[PDB]
Design a protein around this nucleic acid. Structure first.
Lengths: 50, 50, 123, 50
DNA sequence: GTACGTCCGATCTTCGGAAGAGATTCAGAG
DNA sequence: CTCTGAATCTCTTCCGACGCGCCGCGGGACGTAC
RNA sequence: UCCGCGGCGCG
């Protein structure tokens, strides 16, 4: 909903989806550069938590 | 409706950490060990063999 | 100490966008306590891709992985306490929390070789 | 009987247990344990009664 | 002063009531 | 001896009446340039 | 602009 002013009343669903898609995109980008195993394990854990 | 191509598989909470753990008692496991396995703290064996 | 083990790299997590001041803070905390033998060098991978136009101009800083930074700590207790004492740092990451897990040497060599060719198209 | 149920009888060990149950996961070194204990009930900054 | 990209570290502390699942225990046959 | 076993103690979840009127605050901060 | 939180009040 575009309320008064140059601000947006973002629903929590939008924030959750943005976080999840950002984590997924970061993991997908990181998986094509042969990152260290610990790094991808931690990032996968973060994605699973999200 | 759209879909997000998850790079790595993830586990459903509703089928994991309810009062009866569906995956836990389907595989004849407690909840603590499956939780530890899913959150990247310990390894599990597949097809031990000889 | 009595033994002479290699100061193999470890990984410590930090807030995204705060890596530089975290590294500098590690530098002054290791300087003020005066154990230069215990700690080696700290460095984070960094890329410099240049574009003439299109918003950002003539320079752009990109990192392979921003949330993590590598250090040259050694398996001890006082040194690890010093690592966690620095602000804007959560802690170590690894297989187990009690002892932080190390990094494979062969992939360290591979990533060092990859980082040896950062400079492309000078001037 | 309370002293009989006591698992340990060392002041350093007692600091070890208090440091462990203050927050789990941390190895109990003596210096950090004493610094933490001195900052729970005996430090003027984080503890004072009006 | 102001538009814009990016991003998610310090510390909490005071309900019955019940329903159910998991860890413990000691009791016993032996 | 030692394993089982039924009972017991401990930890985790969910639940708590229904309508209405009015008012006030709501992604904020933090670096990076322009 | 039609949503959320908090507070006060009437049944």
């Amino acid at each position: 909903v575009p309320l008064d002013g140059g601000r947006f009343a973002t629903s929590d669903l939008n924030d959750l989806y943005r976080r999840v898609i950002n984590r997924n995109n970061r993991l997908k980008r990181l998986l094509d550069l042969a990152a260290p195993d610990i790094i991808v394990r931690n990032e996968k854990r973060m994605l699973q938590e999200a | 409706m759209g879909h997000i191509e998850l790079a790595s598989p993830t586990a459903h909470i509703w089928f994991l950490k309810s009062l009866p753990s569906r995956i836990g008692l389907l595989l004849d496991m407690p909840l603590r060990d499956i939780e530890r396995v899913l959150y990247f703290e310990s390894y599990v064996v597949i097809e031990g063999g000889m | 100490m009595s033994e002479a083990p290699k100061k193999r790299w470890y990984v410590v997590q930090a807030f995204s966008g705060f890596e530089g001041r975290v590294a500098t803070s590690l530098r002054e905390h290791i300087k003020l306590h005066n154990m230069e033998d215990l700690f080696g060098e700290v460095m984070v991978p960094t890329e410099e891709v240049v574009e003439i136009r299109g918003g950002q101009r003539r320079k752009s800083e990109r990192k392979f992985f921003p949330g993590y930074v590598l250090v040259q700590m050694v398996m001890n207790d006082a040194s690890w306490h010093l690592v966690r004492s620095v602000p804007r740092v959560m802690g170590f990451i690894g297989g187990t929390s009690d002892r932080p897990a190390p990094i494979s040497d062969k992939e360290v060599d591979a990533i060092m070789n990859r980082l040896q060719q950062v400079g492309d198209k000078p001037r | 009987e309370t002293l009989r149920v006591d698992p340990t009888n060392d002041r350093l060990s007692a600091l070890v247990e208090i440091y462990r149950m203050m927050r789990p996961g941390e190895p109990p070194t003596r210096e950090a344990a004493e610094s933490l204990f001195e900052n729970l009930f005996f430090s003027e900054d984080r503890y004072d009664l009006s």
